[PDB]
Write a protein that binds this ligand. Structure first.
Ligand SMILES: Cc1cn([C@H]2C[C@H](O)[C@@H](CO)O2)c(=O)[nH]c1=O
Ligand SMILES: Cc1cn([C@H]2C[C@H](O)[C@@H](CO)O2)c(=O)[nH]c1=O
Ligand SMILES: Cc1cn([C@H]2C[C@H](O)[C@@H](CO)O2)c(=O)[nH]c1=O
Ligand SMILES: Cc1cn([C@H]2C[C@H](O)[C@@H](CO)O2)c(=O)[nH]c1=O
Ligand SMILES: [Zn+2]
Ligand SMILES: [Zn+2]
Ligand SMILES: [Zn+2]
Ligand SMILES: [Zn+2]
Lengths: 164, 164, 173, 173
């Protein structure tokens, strides 16, 4: 019946591209896919609690959740949908800019049938796989929406070096 | 220094999306990428022999070749470029519609640092991973350019069943 | 230089075998490899093919780990300080390879292995085959004896790996 | 129902260990597993943990394979009829798992394993660690003794796995 697939890794690793790659595969076989985006055959939605999707997700074979770390109830949602027979596919950061985990994505790891962690390329040294996201601006808000001028994906030693 | 990464699998598996996912990762780290398409920071090209790229590829860190099975000299090209220090990334069909291999992509398998085979979803039964491409029109031309109205990706047993 | 590779999944998924596969690769290239096992864990021991030690926490290895290129930690969920140990060692240039359960018998995470996920360069989650229905990939471990101790050391005499629906079916009974 | 899983890569990459990891998973779910080895291949034998046989070609197994859920073929490149055997068995509903070299010591493909790639549901290529430089992933096998026999049975006494540039450097010498 149902399942949970989780795609994790730092920023700039292509997690969302991989999520969509997987959604597209299902669409070619005539499966209905519902894509849930965050904001503070097919159907799309931008939302801020998974509670706000209501029961719309039940009309679909495949449910995809992007930026899963922004949703506070994501693990319970995914479990409920997978228990109802859906293929659920989630892309999320596993770690925040302090290399500390998103507790809800932890729960997903433990509930997932598959977990892939993608890597990026180090934006500091340009020579190594990157597994970490470095926040290049001062802020102690955990959630801070932004791109390459506020964050960069780095290798282990560039992360240490830049922590000075 | 250099390497060869190969992405194989049947049609509708998202091989090209995965190739581009990888190219994008490199671009975020300021690496130059040259993309070579078939037709009968960045640069694109449509060509029919890899001979026709000349030595343009030497100006790039990363070389990507799409639809590799259409190029008759692809293995030697990839080896030459990887021996010169390039990251080479190739997407190709491993098997033709008769489940017979493309001999040049065989050579690549043996020369590659990494080989991933993606799956599609079965377009006949809609219930299983698909690893094969079934040609739905009569033709005994090996090369026959087309989409879902001429081909479908199928699972092992749907391929047998449809072979009647 | 250094890195953390994590292998997770339920019981019966071959996590230790994958660990030892990776160690052997390094050994062919003449790299020094140290395997750290948990002293309480009782289960051919492939882990006797290089330098190794049995401890109850990682503090008791002392600084012996510094003498190696590669450090492998088996049954990582048993060690209370595993994340920090791994990070210290990977910061000193070691290739650190850890096998661990990500989830306990209640599908609740081991918090220390959660930290490792976030610190790891590589994370693979292996599957088992459902030992109840025999027809599906299994991602969960089901405890088949009555005990509410979170830690309870054992094998197929006390646990089985199951698919998502077999885990539900068996919990309701 | 049936499938073909292929594990390729150079020597010292742990292909047989991965094969036996997969067999063990199936065994925990009580599935019948048969391991077919090559009679000429001399190299703890994990492959003695289920039903097994040593043959020179696959024809000599006869129909014994039909009694199993899972068939594993080790050193597939030695068998002249391996592709057809695998396809026959996978068409009868078996999970067939093959480990093999994809490339010989000259980086030239084993044609029969090429056919398997095209017939396989899953293909993984494992790497080794470069046994010359000790600093890079290795995807090639280098023969360290003089012999132009394509088939020459041996281990680290006759071969080493190497990265792309170490293979060039050593060929020029
Ligand atoms: C690493 C990190 C990223 N982000 C954001 C930046 C982007 O908008 C988004 C990454 O997709 O999440 C945070 O909010 N906090 C963090 O700690
Ligand atoms: C399976 C198969 C696909 N193709 C084509 C169809 C598409 O144009 C392309 C797949 O990208 O290759 C062939 O030319 N021959 C074949 O046997
Ligand atoms: C799933 C699970 C296993 N175990 C034990 C059984 C084994 O000895 C070890 C896993 O190999 O962990 C626990 O102690 N708690 C649990 O929740
Ligand atoms: C690379 C290579 C290995 N071998 C042998 C050595 C081993 O006995 C077996 C690989 O495990 O294959 C060959 O016979 N020819 C070759 O080209
Ligand atoms: Zn770096
Ligand atoms: Zn089908
Ligand atoms: Zn089950
Ligand atoms: Zn080397």
């Amino acid at each position: 019946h149902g399942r949970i697939e989780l795609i994790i890794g730092p920023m700039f690793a292509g997690k969302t591209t991989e999520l969509m790659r997987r959604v597209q595969r299902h669409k070619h076989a005539q499966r209905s896919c519902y894509i849930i985006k965050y904001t503070g055959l097919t159907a799309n939605v931008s939302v801020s609690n998974l509670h706000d999707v209501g029961d719309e997700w039940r009309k679909y074979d495949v449910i995809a959740v992007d930026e899963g770390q922004f949703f506070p109830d994501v693990a319970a949602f995914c479990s409920k949908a997978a228990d109802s027979g859906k293929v659920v596919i989630v892309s999320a950061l596993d770690a925040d800019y302090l290399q500390e985990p998103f507790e809800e994505i932890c729960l997903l790891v433990s509930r997932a049938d598959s977990v892939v962690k993608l890597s990026a390329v180090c934006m500091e040294c340009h020579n190594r796989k990157a597994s970490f996201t470095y926040r290049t601006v001062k802020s102690d808000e955990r959630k801070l929406v932004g791109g390459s001028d506020m964050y960069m994906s780095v290798c282990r030693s560039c992360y240490e070096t830049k922590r000075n």
